[PDB]
């Protein structure tokens, strides 16, 4: 089998991007947050605290006729950006892009933090990273991706983001036609759950690549490009104007630059981030201070290539026995 949604981003910012998801009998559709950097499948519901709950779409497992409460399981879990959710667990019937698992393990929010309600775009959050991560108590529960693995003709998905403009996601199978040139394979270490790999180096706009290796995570969930310091430091230094304010939390530069472009390694192939993609606009409403895509990862304990780097390229996140993490241009 194989399955394929487009996925789009919920603001001009690309802050995220959202994948109608069918869950239940007869379906019901929820716009998720891909997220390779977690592990649980959860939706707002019609047991999300009623003052909790914003403009999202909820599920209600009561009016579908294949939900099964999961005795006794809970889960909750606390996201890198201090977010946080919890609730109980129903399995039932979820298909994405035409791929469907029976079964799933669909955690049902009893409670959402404030970041969540105040996001009316996004139903919930459907986890890709490893299912090692899941929060699912006492009996840990699988990602959609593994309990589809067997049933894929290959054992892959891949992500595919676009840059103001949707994109995709596809379960099973390699779109040959989604890419230029080749992909190059690089190795992940599933030892703290994630799909953790080492990049290679780094340049800044036309300079010279500074070959130095970087471990960090390929992770859809998050939207900036989170790097050492001393990375991050170099290239904001080619931006007049630009600083870190302590204020903000950030990062930032005048909104009258023009940004250079950022390149990543993969081995010894290179995946070029357009400087446009490294805005993420005025810090307030008619700010003429903006607010910066590369952001140091010293206060977080580990490098992250979030949306910035990845809508850069077509990734290929390879679940084979030995996993591996794929890169090509587009
Ligand atoms: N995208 C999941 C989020 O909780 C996350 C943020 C940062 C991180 F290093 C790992 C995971």
């Known amino acids: 089998s ?3 949604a487009t996925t789009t981003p919920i603001d001009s910012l690309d802050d995220a991007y959202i994948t109608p998801v069918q869950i239940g009998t007869p379906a019901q559709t929820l716009n998720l947050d891909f997220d390779t950097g977690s592990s649980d499948l959860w939706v707002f519901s019609s047991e999300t605290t009623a ?6 779409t909820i ?7 294949t939900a099964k ?5 809970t889960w909750s879990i606390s996201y890198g950006d201090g977010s946080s959710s919890s609730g109980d667990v129903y399995t039932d ?3 994405v892009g035409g791929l469907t698992v029976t079964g799933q393990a669909v955690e049902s929010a009893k409670k959402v933090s404030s970041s969540f309600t105040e996001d009316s775009t996004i139903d919930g959050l459907l986890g890709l990273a490893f299912s090692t991560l899941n929060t699912v108590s006492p009996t840990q529960q699988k990602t959609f991706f593994d309990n589809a693995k067997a049933s894929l003709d290959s054992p892959v998905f891949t992500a595919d983001l676009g840059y103001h403009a949707p994109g995709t996601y596809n379960f099973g199978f390699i779109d040959t036609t989604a890419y230029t040139g080749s992909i190059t394979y690089t190795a992940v270490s599933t030892k703290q759950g994630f799909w953790e790999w080492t990049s290679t180096g780094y340049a800044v706009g036309s300079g010279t690549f500074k070959s130095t290796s970087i471990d960090g995570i390929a992770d859809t969930g998050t ?3 989170y790097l050492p310091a001393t990375v991050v430091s170099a290239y904001w230094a080619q931006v007049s104007g630009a600083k870190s304010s302590s204020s903000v939390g950030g990062y930032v530069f005048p909104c009258s630059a023009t940004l250079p472009s950022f390149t990543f390694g993969v081995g010894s192939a290179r995946i070029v981030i357009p400087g446009d993609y490294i805005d993420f606009g005025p810090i ?3 700010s003429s201070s903006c607010f910066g895509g590369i952001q140091s990862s010293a206060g977080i304990g580990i490098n992250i290539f979030g949306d910035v780097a990845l809508k850069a390229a077509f990734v290929v996140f390879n679940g084979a026995t030995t996993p591996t993490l794929g890169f090509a241009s587009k």
Do not use: C, F, I, M
């Not at 003052?51 to 999202?56: A, C, I, K, L, M």
């Not at 599920?59 to 006729?65: E, G, R, V």
């Not at 409460?69 to 399981?73: E, H, P, R, V, Y």
């Open 2 to 4: 194989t399955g394929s």
């Open 51 to 56: 003052s909790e709950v914003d403009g999202q």
């Open 59 to 65: 599920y209600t497992p009561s009016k579908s006729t």
């Open 69 to 73: 409460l999961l005795s006794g399981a």
């Open 93 to 95: 019937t979820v298909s």
């Open 223 to 225: 939207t900036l490009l």
């Open 284 to 286: 307030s409403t008619g």
